[PDB]
Design an enzyme around this catalytic site. Structure first.
Site, PDB file in Angstrom:
ATOM      1  N   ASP A  93       7.502   4.296  -0.446  1.00 25.19           N
ATOM      2  CA  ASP A  93       8.803   3.705  -0.180  1.00 25.19           C
ATOM      3  C   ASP A  93       9.772   3.904  -1.332  1.00 25.19           C
ATOM      4  O   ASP A  93      10.977   3.696  -1.160  1.00 25.19           O
ATOM      5  CB  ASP A  93       8.645   2.213   0.118  1.00 25.19           C
ATOM      6  CG  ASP A  93       7.786   1.951   1.337  1.00 25.19           C
ATOM      7  OD1 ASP A  93       8.117   2.463   2.427  1.00 25.19           O
ATOM      8  OD2 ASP A  93       6.764   1.245   1.198  1.00 25.19           O
ATOM      9  N   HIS A 148       0.790  -1.233   0.000  1.00 26.83           N
ATOM     10  CA  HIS A 148       0.000   0.000   0.000  1.00 26.83           C
ATOM     11  C   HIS A 148       0.829   1.295   0.000  1.00 26.83           C
ATOM     12  O   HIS A 148       0.372   2.329   0.494  1.00 26.83           O
ATOM     13  CB  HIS A 148      -0.937   0.016   1.220  1.00 26.83           C
ATOM     14  CG  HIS A 148      -2.157   0.866   1.037  1.00 26.83           C
ATOM     15  ND1 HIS A 148      -2.639   1.220  -0.206  1.00 26.83           N
ATOM     16  CD2 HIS A 148      -2.997   1.430   1.938  1.00 26.83           C
ATOM     17  CE1 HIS A 148      -3.721   1.962  -0.063  1.00 26.83           C
ATOM     18  NE2 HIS A 148      -3.960   2.105   1.228  1.00 26.83           N
TER      19      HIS A 148
HETATM   20  N1  LIG Z   1       3.871  -5.883   1.742  1.00 23.17           N
HETATM   21  C1  LIG Z   1       3.703  -4.955   2.846  1.00 23.17           C
HETATM   22  O1  LIG Z   1       2.862  -4.118   2.813  1.00 23.17           O
HETATM   23  C2  LIG Z   1       4.615  -5.061   4.064  1.00 23.17           C
HETATM   24  C3  LIG Z   1       5.599  -6.214   4.135  1.00 23.17           C
HETATM   25  N2  LIG Z   1       6.105  -6.673   5.409  1.00 23.17           N
HETATM   26  C4  LIG Z   1       6.713  -7.982   5.458  1.00 23.17           C
HETATM   27  O2  LIG Z   1       5.615  -9.064   5.971  1.00 23.17           O
HETATM   28  C5  LIG Z   1       6.284 -10.011   6.591  1.00 23.17           C
HETATM   29  C6  LIG Z   1       5.876 -10.060   8.098  1.00 23.17           C
HETATM   30  O3  LIG Z   1       6.149  -8.836   8.735  1.00 23.17           O
HETATM   31  P1  LIG Z   1       6.023  -8.742  10.384  1.00 23.17           P
HETATM   32  O4  LIG Z   1       4.568  -8.702  10.765  1.00 23.17           O
HETATM   33  O5  LIG Z   1       6.748  -7.529  10.920  1.00 23.17           O
HETATM   34  O6  LIG Z   1       6.797 -10.089  10.895  1.00 23.17           O
HETATM   35  P2  LIG Z   1       6.441 -11.005  12.202  1.00 23.17           P
HETATM   36  O7  LIG Z   1       7.740 -11.650  12.626  1.00 23.17           O
HETATM   37  O8  LIG Z   1       5.807 -10.140  13.264  1.00 23.17           O
HETATM   38  O9  LIG Z   1       5.357 -12.141  11.723  1.00 23.17           O
HETATM   39  C7  LIG Z   1       5.797 -13.148  10.868  1.00 23.17           C
HETATM   40  C8  LIG Z   1       5.008 -14.417  11.269  1.00 23.17           C
HETATM   41  O10 LIG Z   1       5.238 -15.353  10.393  1.00 23.17           O
HETATM   42  C9  LIG Z   1       5.578 -16.673  11.276  1.00 23.17           C
HETATM   43  N3  LIG Z   1       6.269 -17.631  10.450  1.00 23.17           N
HETATM   44  C10 LIG Z   1       7.580 -17.773  10.213  1.00 23.17           C
HETATM   45  N4  LIG Z   1       7.756 -18.806   9.389  1.00 23.17           N
HETATM   46  C11 LIG Z   1       6.541 -19.306   9.113  1.00 23.17           C
HETATM   47  C12 LIG Z   1       6.142 -20.363   8.326  1.00 23.17           C
HETATM   48  N5  LIG Z   1       6.883 -21.307   7.518  1.00 23.17           N
HETATM   49  N6  LIG Z   1       4.858 -20.668   8.209  1.00 23.17           N
HETATM   50  C13 LIG Z   1       3.929 -19.935   8.868  1.00 23.17           C
HETATM   51  N7  LIG Z   1       4.316 -18.897   9.646  1.00 23.17           N
HETATM   52  C14 LIG Z   1       5.625 -18.584   9.765  1.00 23.17           C
HETATM   53  C15 LIG Z   1       6.279 -16.200  12.273  1.00 23.17           C
HETATM   54  O11 LIG Z   1       6.266 -17.125  13.441  1.00 23.17           O
HETATM   55  C16 LIG Z   1       5.547 -14.893  12.646  1.00 23.17           C
HETATM   56  O12 LIG Z   1       4.524 -15.079  13.533  1.00 23.17           O
HETATM   57  C17 LIG Z   1       7.779  -9.641   6.444  1.00 23.17           C
HETATM   58  O13 LIG Z   1       8.326 -10.191   5.327  1.00 23.17           O
HETATM   59  C18 LIG Z   1       7.723  -8.108   6.285  1.00 23.17           C
HETATM   60  O14 LIG Z   1       8.994  -7.622   5.676  1.00 23.17           O
HETATM   61  C19 LIG Z   1       5.978  -5.821   6.578  1.00 23.17           C
HETATM   62  C20 LIG Z   1       5.147  -4.540   6.526  1.00 23.17           C
HETATM   63  C21 LIG Z   1       4.358  -4.164   5.271  1.00 23.17           C
HETATM   64  O1  LIG Z   2      10.216  -0.793   6.649  1.00 22.44           O
HETATM   65  C1  LIG Z   2       9.435  -1.770   6.787  1.00 22.44           C
HETATM   66  O2  LIG Z   2       9.631  -2.647   7.670  1.00 22.44           O
HETATM   67  C2  LIG Z   2       8.265  -1.879   5.871  1.00 22.44           C
HETATM   68  O3  LIG Z   2       7.973  -0.522   5.397  1.00 22.44           O
HETATM   69  C3  LIG Z   2       6.859  -0.551   4.397  1.00 22.44           C
HETATM   70  O4  LIG Z   2       6.644   0.710   3.945  1.00 22.44           O
HETATM   71  C4  LIG Z   2       7.199  -1.462   3.228  1.00 22.44           C
HETATM   72  O5  LIG Z   2       6.049  -1.551   2.371  1.00 22.44           O
HETATM   73  C5  LIG Z   2       7.559  -2.828   3.674  1.00 22.44           C
HETATM   74  O6  LIG Z   2       8.050  -3.582   2.544  1.00 22.44           O
HETATM   75  C6  LIG Z   2       8.625  -2.821   4.726  1.00 22.44           C
HETATM   76  O7  LIG Z   2       8.792  -4.150   5.228  1.00 22.44           O
END
Ligand SMILES: NC(=O)C1=CN([C@@H]2O[C@H](COP(=O)(O)OP(=O)(O)OC[C@H]3O[C@@H](n4cnc5c(N)ncnc54)[C@H](O)[C@@H]3O)[C@@H](O)[C@H]2O)C=CC1
Ligand SMILES: O=C(O)[C@H]1O[C@@H](O)[C@H](O)[C@@H](O)[C@@H]1O
Ligand SMILES: NC(=O)C1=CN([C@@H]2O[C@H](COP(=O)(O)OP(=O)(O)OC[C@H]3O[C@@H](n4cnc5c(N)ncnc54)[C@H](O)[C@@H]3O)[C@@H](O)[C@H]2O)C=CC1
Ligand SMILES: O=C(O)[C@H]1O[C@@H](O)[C@H](O)[C@@H](O)[C@@H]1O
Lengths: 469, 469
Positions: free
Chosen positions: B268, B183
């Site tokens: 971003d 987003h």
């Molecule tokens: N596309 C977007 O808008 C955004 C992307 N992200 C990304 O989303 C992902 C999660 O971000 P967070 O909430 O901060 O991480 P988090 O660490 O709080 O949550 C990740 C969850 O996935 C679990 N997990 C790990 N391996 C797993 C597996 N094989 N199967 C099922 N669950 C598993 C973990 O135990 C954890 O609970 C990251 O890759 C982050 O960089 C973060 C913010 C925005």
């Molecule tokens: O900085 C971050 O952790 C996050 O910031 C958000 O804006 C991005 O969409 C996401 O990809 C990143 O994981």
């Protein structure tokens, strides 16, 4: 009536080669063939003309040779225009290599080893000048525009560097009939010699961009021949030694690139590697052997001095010819004035193909037009083509270049060409800055500003400075 | 029967947002809507499940919530699979941010400021992991393959990073029905607020790649609105100050990029500039204001600690809910458990569009398919699309992205994606080396070998090390 015009006919590396080839090509060595020799350096032009005339006489050729200091006169009604010119500011310099030398030293002063024009996949010395190659592109575009008025049917045979950038820009911005010429493909014959293969028995192809070409097909007795290179790498590469600073085709760098890309880089492509092979002179000597190749702070000044002495010697030789009209140039200087043998360069075979239908396979810089399907139609590539009376016909490139060549080599080099063209047409110094912002040697933005400032402030860059003001 | 499965439902930044949105969307808040919460971290999964159940109760929603530690069970027959997982090695770590933290410090130890994963046009922290993002791509591909057997009709809604690389790889290598979600386009509303424009009166469009999107159309009262940004730059940029480390949309860096490219980078993308803005912390503070943005050695550890504390607090809160079932989460923690308002994220609008034909305009990562005609059909772009019952329909992008955006920004970033995918599928450490050979921070080849060696030898990279062995 056949008019072949050499723009920059004082050129020490082409002028007499072109005249000798024309005079020794049966279908062109005729009274109806007029060779116009044009240059802005009066002493070099007069010298080249005297030698060319005497030479043609000893070859017993009836071609007519005309000298002119007028670009318009040389272009007017030409059938072929060969651009070997290398601009220079005559208030400060005597030839074009001097501006590149001096800007290179300024680059090194500010921390850019081998100058800002040396970049990844673009190490060939003198290829670009301050990135956008302003004097060299300016001249080529001027020739192109005069051509479309005064010589519509002519081919502009672009030899002066940067061949890729210039051929692209003239094609795209003027649609003039420009074809880029370079014989780097000749490196394949060294590969075949080192592997003990009769070249007539090798089924081979090369393709890419200028100084970025790859041995995409290499076959022998109905099999892939690359295993024979693998064996050479294992058994004979440890003992490889370069014969001279230019000898790099079978170097450790070439083989390291082959291992990564899956096909052997050919010719000057081997010079145009990543920074892996070029961080400093010691690194160059590891990867190219004892000289460190030609693109370094020891060997390149040596070579440019050799060229300067050669120009001076040819001027004196012309005066000797005027004083001793009985001397035979072909006898006393057979290295400079060969007889019988053609030079092997592609320019005169191309002319004979167009003008006399002597069909021939050449490697020329022409628009892709789908030959390499993952690249734009209009991007100028160095491609195997057949030339005859009535067109330039691209060979099918098979096998296709590898995925790694496309994404790690050809596309980055093509993007650099687009950066350099944008830097030229925009007249915007910020584009030059952006190119250096992608340069691994840059430590800070302030460094970029300072190095361009000092380059732009060199006296012989007045015109360049005003262009970007 | 409607099965929505959240893979990584312990996610602190998505899990409860997704549940709240579903429970507050009229057409989805039904007894026939089953939300599967799946995770490998037992305590986080149990916590997220308790809170989700209590939350849905307070929202008076009849959706069924199921928790499972089985990926197969979550995928089996799913209609939508939302991948928010962030893999980690549970022998050494508690969450996925820790491996990126530690590899980043190793990178900096060897002279790569902000780690080897920080590259030009790719500064967003945690986006890639050791370039090829092995654990994250591995999981996404595993989900994709299980999907094609156990849930053929499902959409894989990819949220975990790297969104660009992963969405590309799953599309290209498996043909699974993956769509990437981010987003960042929401930054446009700050532009309109700073320029005193009613957003409903602005005719706007954004396009590019993930974290590489550009305000290609910006119009107001039937005229180009970019002159209004030019006026803001002249009159109000000198007084601009970031509200927090994340506030960069109107920063000096964003405006410097707009001046060069001709269109404003959105979201971003502003983090993903050239090295011009990122050489060191002092440079980041010049171009992003007092915090130096979020992608630096001060602010990023602070933020990752904030996330770690949040996870821990949610685990304790779930225990409080079990001990005090009369407490109202929506009353005592409205920031974590909003009521009435939707979150504004795109995931549930997308689901409601597909499942219930509530047509909506979204910005999603989908194959180009000619929308940006100078780029390959199959390259995943972040594009404006309309979603409904029966397809994803790309908007015509008009005006087209500028020439400079294409050659200086989009193509280099697309090439990096291809480098990263090749590094993954090849299992070839030499590809990782080549990526760093194009890295401005590299001083020598030996440095590259040494930094990858130490990264690969970290205990929690055993699986990665064996993959590349
Ligand atoms: N596309 C977007 O808008 C955004 C992307 N992200 C990304 O989303 C992902 C999660 O971000 P967070 O909430 O901060 O991480 P988090 O660490 O709080 O949550 C990740 C969850 O996935 C679990 N997990 C790990 N391996 C797993 C597996 N094989 N199967 C099922 N669950 C598993 C973990 O135990 C954890 O609970 C990251 O890759 C982050 O960089 C973060 C913010 C925005
Ligand atoms: O900085 C971050 O952790 C996050 O910031 C958000 O804006 C991005 O969409 C996401 O990809 C990143 O994981
Ligand atoms: N494509 C290829 O195969 C190769 C490319 N080159 C390039 O060819 C060009 C010439 O190379 P050299 O012979 O070493 O240089 P050179 O300095 O010996 O000859 C260049 C000639 O062009 C003249 N000249 C300069 N400005 C002119 C103008 N406006 N109009 C007409 N003549 C002008 C010069 O006075 C000079 O006589 C360079 O760009 C060089 O980098 C060199 C070797 C091979
Ligand atoms: O190094 C040189 O001067 C020349 O070397 C040749 O191989 C290249 O084809 C030519 O572009 C260079 O100008």
């Amino acid at each position: 009536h056949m008019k072949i015009s050499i723009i920059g006919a004082g050129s020490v590396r082409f002028a007499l080669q072109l005249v000798g080839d024309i005079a020794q090509t049966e279908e062109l060595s005729r009274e109806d063939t007029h060779i116009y020799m044009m240059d802005v350096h009066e002493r070099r032009l007069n010298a080249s003309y005297i030698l060319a005339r005497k030479y043609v006489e000893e070859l017993n050729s009836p071609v007519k040779i005309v000298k002119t200091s007028s670009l318009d006169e040389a272009i007017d009604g030409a059938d072929f225009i060969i651009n070997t010119a290398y601009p220079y500011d005559p208030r400060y310099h005597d030839s074009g290599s001097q501006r590149w030398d001096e800007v290179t030293k300024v680059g090194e002063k500010h921390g850019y080893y081998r100058g800002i024009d040396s970049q990844e996949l673009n190490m060939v010395s003198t290829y670009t000048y301050v990135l956008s190659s302003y004097p060299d592109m300016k001249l080529a575009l001027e020739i192109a525009e005069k051509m479309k008025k005064m010589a519509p049917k002519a081919y502009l045979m672009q030899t002066a560097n940067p061949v890729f950038e210039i051929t692209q820009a003239v094609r795209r911005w003027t649609g003039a009939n420009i074809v880029g010429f370079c014989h780097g493909v000749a490196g394949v014959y060294e590969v075949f010699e080192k592997l003990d293969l009769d070249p007539e028995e090798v089924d081979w192809q090369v393709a890419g961009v200028n100084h970025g070409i790859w041995l995409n097909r290499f076959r022998y007795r109905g099999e892939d021949a690359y295993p024979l290179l693998d064996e050479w790498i294992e058994k004979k590469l440890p003992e490889w030694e370069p014969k001279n600073p230019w000898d790099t085709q079978m170097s450790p760098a070439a083989m390291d690139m082959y291992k990564f890309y899956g096909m052997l880089p050919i010719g000057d492509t081997v010079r145009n590697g990543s920074w892996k092979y070029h961080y400093n002179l010691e690194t160059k000597k590891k990867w190219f052997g004892k000289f460190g190749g030609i693109d370094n702070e020891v060997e390149r000044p040596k070579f440019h001095e050799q060229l300067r002495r050669a120009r001076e010697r040819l001027i004196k030789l012309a005066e000797e010819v005027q004083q001793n009209p009985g001397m035979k140039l072909t006898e006393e200087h057979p290295e400079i004035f060969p007889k019988g043998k053609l030079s092997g360069e592609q320019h005169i075979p191309f002319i004979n193909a167009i003008a006399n239908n002597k069909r021939v396979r050449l490697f020329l810089n022409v628009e892709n037009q789908g030959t390499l399907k993952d690249f734009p139609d209009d991007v100028v590539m160095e491609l195997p083509v057949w030339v005859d009376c009535c067109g330039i016909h691209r060979e099918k490139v098979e096998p296709d270049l590898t995925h790694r060549i496309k994404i790690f080599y050809l596309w980055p080099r093509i993007l650099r060409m687009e950066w350099n063209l944008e830097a030229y047409i925009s007249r915007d110094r910020k584009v030059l800055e952006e190119i250096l912002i992608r340069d691994p040697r840059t430590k800070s933005y302030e460094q970029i500003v300072q190095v361009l400032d000092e380059i732009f402030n060199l006296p012989f860059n007045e015109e360049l400075r005003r262009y970007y003001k």
